[PDB]
Design a protein around this ligand. Structure first.
Ligand code: ADP
Lengths: 457, 600, 72, 47, 410, 250
């Protein structure tokens, strides 16, 4: 039942250091409870107790500590953890990174006060994500197919059209109830306006929710922003049984907020100064995906991240790559050549694809065709690297065919218009229209039965 | 009122009786009143990072808390002023002290009192009238160029209880009084705003109108929108002064702010010497640019906090002029020097290093700075749009753009004007590398070009394609010689040479090229690309014929058109009106049409 | 004699350009990526040492605070 | 494959910079050899 | 009974390990073999197959029971195991039965509390030592021992202990050591004699994909088997992505006494396979700066057989029924054919390069192109559809066909 | 023989004492009981990890890579318990075995050991990957007492000269092997091809043994000359012309 006991309010700010306000004389501090701070000028702020010890409570302040005062600050301890006022009516709405509305509508009337952290979905009750989504993009639906409830990020260099690809997934995604939750961390308004405008223009609003943390909004909200989005997605996908697609924009800016907090708290650094626990913290975001026992609903996720300095080995793409099932990669080596969408298949992979393809889902050839496209594209890059040393005179006639394959593959299989939608079946037809460039006997990844049914067609 | 110094260690001063203090409040420490920012509280004690040199500070010295964090005194008296990065007026420090040095612990007010400015109250206001934050309660006619719109502070609101009549006032005379919740505010013309807080607005608009620099490569191939964010590689050979001075002498901007983030002492003084002597035409007068700029200049040995605050001061000034409905532009002469200052602050705060030694927050400090650019509906009632355009230069060590401050800046800025030492060594002024450079703003400016310059979208596309094709064809020229190329490729290379020599280069040291308006720019490109299309048409139309056209036939029979095309840059807007320049350019179009018709 | 020279030059150019391209696309890229990895791991050793030394300085500050309390 | 895998140290940083100067020198000299041979080869073709 | 997990369950003696742990995979069983009672790591970057191998041992191995520890692994891993293991079946005494009846799962998925990762490892090894005392040849998977080491890092960080490298505590080496040393083949405690074992398979997940990582470095100094997974193979979808240059097994001298009995032909073939692959790398470093035309014809044959070994032996598709499992008799028969081609093709050149009637790699390819295609086709033989005698007879026919074709070139 | 066994499951802290017990037994046996003790220490890295574990728990200031600052003196109190002494016939030889982390010869464990011990015998991954047992790379190996342990009355008198010339030949051999890798085999001179042929024959015949091969010093130098005779007489620069005239024509 409701917490009937009246909240204590403390002026006992015994110190302030970085983003932390250290209360004292506190009565039974509750770890991770939320405190509402009132500054001397009456400005409201909020903060989470990150450590407790006897009478002390180390409140991290979301809106930052600038202007906190050791005598005039008032800290109202709410007696409970951070909760989201979730409801169905969050679809068709826009909220800032702290869950306050910014669409000039009212506050959310809560159907429930879900804990923002969620809970671990019991691995016995986690239904395996077998059903396919067509995203409409051949570089995905062909060689990187996405399951219903499968978490799979877009990894990109900086300045690439990854937002336009993620918008295209929102525009075109459908199965081979539906809703979207969009989150963004540290997004520039020039990009926030793009997503908000694309959903409004496509008329999608009645089934999408947006959480926006803009580039100038307080950096600590980035930590709760994807959790508010996922908490709303858990309500929609488990309490209301929708298929929800969750888009998380620049998990890089989320990971930068982790690096800031650790640098200010002096927590132990892993690689590149990120928190030593970063894999657990990302897992608390990314594992809130997938189907569950006795619910029709599902949380798909497409995280999005700018890889710093294009480095695939960087902790952000690396830890994301160890959690999420598969990664879609987009590359300057395609985008500079005007190849939109710039999806480089070779570093890409969908872990849940092996299950989302073949009879009842897709044509029986799909599992073989995908692997042979990888072999030909990869050998094409390898003979291209050879050509750059030894020239086309040293390459065999078959090596020239792998170069012609690479050209026809990037022009036909990857390149696709921003409003062009391709079925998986049309994509596999294009797959064979490329694989047919080689003689039948060259196709060393495909079974003889699959070649006999599909190679001459 | 004031606490007392309790301990000192380098720049860090611990003070007691600080119980009423606030985190990041600004304090005057010692009998010399050294500036310092509170970095921590620990009860009745504060730790203050003193900005200035603490040598000689004593235990038991007074510690006067100013009721405010680091903040800019905004108001009349900004235009033509030079400040350091914490907003101290360097011209007044010199003139009041008669010393070559900045004394330790200057108290000098940043907008000089005892100067009287002509103020006109906004004639509609009355006692009992309703007023809101950002309302213009009068105008100060400080300069012929810039009329300073005096306005209510963004947080202030209420009912007017008094307004000053038309007359002469200093910045601390009370000009307006108003009441809210039974409390009166007495307002000076000076307005004080926290330097790290964004000044609020009614709406952050989409940026759509071009910041014309008067430079062909820039205004055509890589336009920066008003309200746009852009970077320049600020290095020795690159010629960074060309864009800086061109923006100063011609730009479509109402006010310009510069920030020196810790430039080298001599390089800073070169800039401070030059700008008083620069001039631009206004209403047929010629006037000094110091009538419409302010300089936030710091050398490398200014206090670390002045270098780190330098951009925040420059943007807070720029947002203030934006809220008057002026289309502000600003430059930072190297954001890398600002990031070195931020690195040093972080090292003194003992915070964890991130990449290359920089703090964790470097990316968010850059991104929150560049996000303060834009076009806006201002606060208050007079329905005025304004903007700030930010031109933050980057200084990648050895030209390596993967360097964190450079890489983060290039991750945020929508335009990069890649100045290149190789072009400057060829004297190819303005020395902008069109392969490295980019702009994301085309999709917005396409509305303006469709309304006013409907031919330009094809022309811009064709120009970039011709240049990209020439870069590929030059490898074939190295492999097999120029004579071995196809006729289509040869004419493409010859037109690309015409573009590189007589469009992309611009002789800004001379009257015909000091600025290049967009009507001139589009007209020149319209002719060069019309020549390309007709020449390539004549070649491809005569493919497999007996009498095949080629570049050599064109140069022999109609080489006067190539001579005229190269000559078109020499037309001067100050001598001949844009209609006459356009008519001469239209005659070259007719001349080349008749010449191509004479061959095929 | 022009032909015997020509054919021998054509081979010697190809051999030389394979060495130049092997340097330009193999040896230099291995070195440049090795050096970028080295500069990265040297910064990792520097941040590890910084963190250890920062915790040591904190532990010494805690020992001083405990001593000041024990002097009561 | 991608790297020489000398173990990260100030020694190895200096050794890699020394190898880079050696390799860039080797490129420039062998490129000069190729240019001279290319010039003679084009002269021979004309002859 | 209740057992303290941190305390090792005692044994009468820790016996030497001397029988292969036959797995699903050709490269494992043949070229880098695990032993029942052996300690093994699978260090690999994301998306390489470290869990596909962990699953494939669990689905297809001669282990009596599997303890599968989902320590810090993704959530859908446990769902995929619970989806497959009730449907997948072994056979005993002529009865089909679900492999879930021989597996236990210790889930602790990446989002479940960080501390429980340590308890999960120690739970799975305590369960494994319990069935080891029953005489069962236990196999224990650990889906990331670095996601365990990260939990030691986090608690150590909250305790404010001094770190050793990348924030890991100084005791990480001893924590890993006192985990892998729980493996072995043992004379169990108590009256009736038993020869149970625990075999441990730690799927190390090095940050950034870099084996200089402290968990990988400490693990490598503790295990006896190292199946290093290369991300460059996994990108090419060359699976299993086990890098045959860096990988090793210390158990080969102990297993040679088994191969000499059950598979007397195999030890020469294993040796020749490693040598052909090593020669391909030592050749490739030359070819990459001059072109393939520089090589001798024996070295073209070495490169081509190393491509056969790479694409058809070492590569194995763990989903498609033909390669979902690969028994050792299929594995040796495939390898025997690929090396029989090598020895005959090499002899054909070496016999004739002394004369005007010289054989070359191109001569062999044009006369024997169908044999090269048939050699690559050997992976498609399916132990579900095709009996052992059928696969053995087909592979004997390819040996005879090659011999008669090479005899036709000489 | 006396064996002390701390296994990898035994408590880490015992390993701080284990080598010190062994050396104390070796001191008793050698200096009080006249024995010619040989001490084997099986893994000085699993020793150094025990010093790191305790020092981290004592919150001590780290030396480089988190080892204690005293690691040099601590290892010296292990490795200096060696050598002959006045009046005694007994002696302690030590052979500390030491696992180089990440194969890094400059890691603190092999580094501080190399400063204290009389050189090192270096076992190389790149020889082991080619089945060359024992994988001892003679190039980064050193014995500081070699120059005085050998000569007339102690070995054949050619010993120092053969070993010096073999070392230079193998070292040049590795450099011409690196040329073949970076610029191709065609860049090698006839003399560089001789050093490469020497390297191939040398790893096959000199280094390789098998685990029960027990060649005398005489057989070692005989194989030495049977390799050195591969080069022309003028190329053997490190050997005096008297020694060449007695042993090169063999
Ligand atoms: N032996 C294999 N056969 C076929 N596909 C494989 C094989 N090994 C790995 N894969 C593919 O690689 C993907 C990534 O491997 P997985 O083990 O799931 O990743 P991780 O190494 O991060 O645990 C798998 O989902 C599967 O698609």
């Amino acid at each position: 039942n409701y917490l009937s006991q009246p909240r204590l309010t403390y002026k006992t700010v015994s110190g302030v250091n970085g983003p932390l306000v250290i209360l004292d004389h506190v009565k039974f501090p509750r770890y991770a409870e939320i405190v509402h701070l009132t500054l001397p000028d009456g400005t409201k702020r909020s903060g989470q107790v990150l450590e407790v010890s006897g009478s002390k409570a180390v409140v991290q302040v979301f809106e930052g500590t600038s202007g906190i005062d050791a005598k005039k600050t008032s800290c109202e301890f709410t007696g409970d953890i951070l909760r989201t006022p979730v409801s169905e009516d969050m679809l068709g709405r826009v909220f800032n990174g702290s869950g306050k509305p910014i669409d000039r509508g009212p506050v959310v009337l809560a159907e429930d006060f879900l804990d923002i952290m969620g809970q671990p979905i019991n691995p016995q009750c986690r239904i395996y994500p077998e059903e396919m989504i067509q995203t409409g993009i051949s570089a995905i639906d062909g060689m990187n197919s996405i399951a219903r409830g499968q978490k799979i990020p877009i990894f990109s260099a900086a300045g690439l059209p990854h937002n336009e690809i993620a918008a295209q997934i929102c525009r075109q995604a459908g199965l081979v109830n539906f809703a979207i939750v969009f989150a963004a961390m540290g997004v520039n308004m020039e990009t926030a306006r793009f997503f908000k405008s694309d959903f409004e223009e496509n008329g999608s609003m009645d089934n999408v929710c947006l959480f926006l943390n803009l580039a100038n909004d307080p950096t600590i909200e980035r930590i709760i922003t994807p959790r508010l989005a996922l908490t709303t997605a858990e309500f929609l996908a488990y309490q209301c049984e929708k298929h929800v697609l969750v888009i998380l924009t620049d998990m890089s800016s989320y990971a930068e907020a982790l690096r800031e907090v650790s640098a200010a708290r002096e927590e132990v650094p892993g690689r590149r100064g990120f928190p030593g626990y970063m894999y657990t913290d990302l897992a608390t975001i990314y594992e809130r995906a997938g189907r569950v026992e006795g619910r029709n609903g599902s949380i798909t996720q497409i995280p999005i991240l700018t890889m710093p300095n294009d480095d695939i080995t960087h902790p952000i793409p690396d830890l994301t790559g160890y959690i999420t099932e598969g990664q879609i990669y987009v590359d300057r080596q395609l985008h500079n050549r005007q190849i939109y969408p710039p999806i480089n298949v070779l570093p890409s992979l969908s872990r849940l694809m092996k299950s989302a393809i073949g009879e009842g889902m897709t044509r029986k050839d799909h599992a073989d065709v995908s692997n042979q496209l990888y072999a030909c594209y990869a050998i094409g890059k390898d003979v291209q690297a050879m050509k750059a040393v030894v020239g086309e005179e040293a390459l065999t006639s078959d090596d020239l065919l792998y170069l012609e394959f690479l050209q026809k593959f990037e022009k036909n299989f990857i390149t696709q218009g921003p409003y062009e939608n391709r079925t998986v079946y049309e994509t596999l037809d294009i797959g064979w229209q490329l694989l047919r460039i080689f003689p039948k006997e060259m196709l060393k990844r495909i079974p003889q039965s699959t070649l006999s049914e599909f190679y001459p067609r | 009122t004031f606490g007392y110094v309790h301990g000192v260690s380098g720049p860090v001063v611990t003070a007691c009786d600080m119980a009423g203090a606030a985190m990041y409040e600004l304090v005057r420490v010692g009998h010399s009143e050294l500036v310092g920012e509170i970095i921590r509280l620990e009860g009745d004690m504060a730790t203050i990072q003193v900005y200035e040199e603490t040598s000689g500070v004593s235990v038991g010295d007074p510690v006067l808390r100013t009721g405010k964090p680091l903040s800019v005194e905004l108001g009349p008296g900004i235009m033509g002023a030079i400040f350091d990065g914490i907003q101290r007026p360097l011209s007044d420090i010199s003139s009041q002290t008669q010393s070559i040095y900045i004394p330790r612990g200057v108290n000098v007010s940043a907008l000089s009192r005892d100067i009287k400015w002509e103020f006109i109250p906004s004639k509609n206001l009355r006692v009992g009238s309703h007023i809101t934050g950002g309302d213009i309660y009068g105008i100060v006619n400080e300069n012929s160029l810039i009329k300073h719109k005096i306005m209510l502070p963004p947080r202030s609101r209420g009912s007017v209880t008094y307004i000053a009549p038309p007359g002469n006032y200093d910045a601390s005379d009370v000009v307006l009084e108003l009441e809210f919740e039974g409390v009166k505010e007495k307002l000076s013309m000076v307005q004080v705003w926290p330097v790290r807080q964004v000044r609020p607005v009614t709406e952050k608009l989409p940026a759509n109108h071009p910041l014309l620099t008067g430079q062909r490569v820039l205004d055509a191939l890589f336009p920066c929108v008003q309200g746009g964010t852009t970077a320049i590689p600020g290095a020795f050979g690159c010629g960074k002064t060309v864009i800086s001075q061109s923006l100063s002498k011609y730009s479509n901007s109402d006010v310009i702010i510069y920030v020196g983030c810790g430039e080298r002492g001599n390089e800073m003084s070169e800039v401070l010497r030059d700008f008083p002597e620069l001039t631009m035409e206004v209403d047929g007068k010629v006037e000094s640019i110091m009538k419409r700029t302010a300089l936030v200049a710091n050398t490398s040995n200014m206090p670390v906090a002045a270098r780190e605050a330098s951009i925040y001061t420059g943007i807070t000034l720029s947002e203030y002029f934006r809220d008057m409905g002026y289309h502000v532009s600003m430059m930072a002469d190297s954001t890398s020097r600002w990031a070195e200052a931020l690195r040093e602050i972080s090292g003194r705060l003992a915070e964890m290093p991130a990449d290359s030694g920089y703090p964790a927050y470097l990316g968010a400090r850059l991104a929150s700075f560049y996000e303060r650019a834009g076009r806006v509906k201002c606060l208050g009632n007079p329905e005025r749009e304004g903007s700030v355009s930010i031109v933050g230069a980057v200084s990648p060590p050895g030209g390596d753009f993967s360097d964190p401050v450079t890489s983060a800046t290039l991750g945020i800025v929508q335009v990069f004007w890649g100045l290149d030492k190789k072009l400057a060594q060829r004297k190819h002024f303005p020395s902008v590398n069109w392969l490295i450079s980019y702009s994301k703003y085309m999709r917005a400016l396409d509305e303006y070009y469709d309304k006013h310059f409907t031919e330009f979208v094809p022309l811009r596309t064709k120009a970039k394609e011709i240049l990209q094709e020439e870069e590929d064809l030059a490898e074939i020229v190295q492999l097999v010689g120029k004579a071995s190329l196809a006729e289509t490729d040869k004419i493409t290379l010859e037109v690309a040479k015409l573009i590189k020599d007589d469009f992309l280069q611009q002789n800004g040291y001379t009257p015909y090229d000091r600025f290049c308006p967009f009507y001139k720019t589009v007209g020149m490109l319209s002719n060069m690309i019309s020549f390309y299309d007709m020449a390539r048409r004549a070649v491809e139309t005569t493919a497999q014929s007996d009498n095949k056209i080629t570049w050599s036939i064109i140069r022999e029979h109609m080489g006067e058109i190539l001579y005229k095309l190269s000559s078109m840059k020499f037309k001067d807007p100050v001598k001949d009106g844009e209609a006459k320049i356009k008519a001469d350019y239209a005659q070259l179009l007719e001349d080349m049409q008749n010449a191509f018709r004479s061959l095929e | 004699s022009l032909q015997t020279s020509f054919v021998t030059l054509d081979e010697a150019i190809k051999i030389t350009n394979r060495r130049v391209n092997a340097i330009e696309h193999v040896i230099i890229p291995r070195i440049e990526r090795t050096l970028a990895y080295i500069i990265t791991e040297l910064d990792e050793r520097e941040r590890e040492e910084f963190y250890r030394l920062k915790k040591i300085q904190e532990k010494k500050k805690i020992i001083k605070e405990k001593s000041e309390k024990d002097l009561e | 494959k991608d790297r020489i895998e000398i173990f990260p140290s100030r020694m190895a940083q200096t050794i890699m910079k020394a190898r880079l100067k050696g390799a860039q020198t080797g490129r420039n000299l062998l490129k000069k050899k190729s240019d001279a041979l290319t010039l003679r080869f084009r002269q021979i073709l004309k002859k």
